[PDB]
Amino acid sequence: ALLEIIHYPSKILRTISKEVVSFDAKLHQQLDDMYETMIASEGIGLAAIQVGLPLRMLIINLPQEDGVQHKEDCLEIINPKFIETGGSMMYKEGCLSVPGFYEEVERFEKVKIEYQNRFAEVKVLEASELLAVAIQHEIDHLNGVLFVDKLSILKRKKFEKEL
Numbered sequence: 001a002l003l004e005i006i007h008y009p010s011k012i013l014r015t016i017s018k019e020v021v022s023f024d025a026k027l028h029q030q031l032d033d034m035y036e037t038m039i040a041s042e043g044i045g046l047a048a049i050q051v052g053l054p055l056r057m058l059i060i061n062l063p064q065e066d067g068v069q070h071k072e073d074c075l076e077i078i079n080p081k082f083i084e085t086g087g088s089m090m091y092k093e094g095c096l097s098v099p100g101f102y103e104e105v106e107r108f109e110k111v112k113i114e115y116q117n118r119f120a121e122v123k124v125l126e127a128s129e130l131l132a133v134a135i136q137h138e139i140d141h142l143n144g145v146l147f148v149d150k151l152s153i154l155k156r157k158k159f160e161k162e163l
């Protein structure tokens with residue numbers, strides 16, 4: 001099913017999402033609907049709160065060389081925790097919950113996270129570049145944070161301007 005994406009300035013997006021404890025058919029149904037919604041919206045990631053589900057789960061699917069997203073490359077990341085973070089990097093981001101606005105955000109250049117997949121299997125993943133940025137963007141959503149919150153004095157005025 002295609003789900004409605006929640007947009008700024010909805011206070012729903014400030015929710016702190018809750019850990020997933022039951023890795024069952026309902027979770028898989030929710031993840032499938034998130035994937036459908038993310039692809040239909042031409043995103044490369046999506047956090048559950050963006051479709052109104054305050055659960056600590058997110059998906060990421062970066063496109064290949066043919067510029068398309070293959071479902072087999074999708075990461076389903078549940079109850080993630082940062083283990084290591086390193087360096088800094090600027091990246092120009094937009095967000096499905098803040099549509100039409102793009103700005104450079106300072107992110108960690110490299111991260112390592114631990115999380116569970118849809119079968120409750122524990123994973124450790126190291127990431128850099130776009131994958132690291134996507135991980136950080138989506139985890140921020142689980143904590144009620146939007147990328148616009150991370151902008152400077154100046155770049156925030158540019159946000160209010162384009163608003």
Ligand SMILES: CCCCC[C@H](CC(=O)NO)C(=O)N[C@H](C(=O)N1CCC[C@H]1CO)C(C)C
Nearest residue numbers: 043044045046092093094095096097133134137
């Ligand atoms: C880059 C880190 C965040 C990526 C995830 C977001 C989707 C989102 O809001 N998830 O919470 C996205 O797909 N954003 C796209 C985006 O910002 N992109 C797509 C490729 C790289 C970057 C633009 O530099 C826009 C165009 C919809």
Ligand SMILES: [Co+2]
Nearest residue numbers: 094095096097
């Ligand atoms: Co977003």
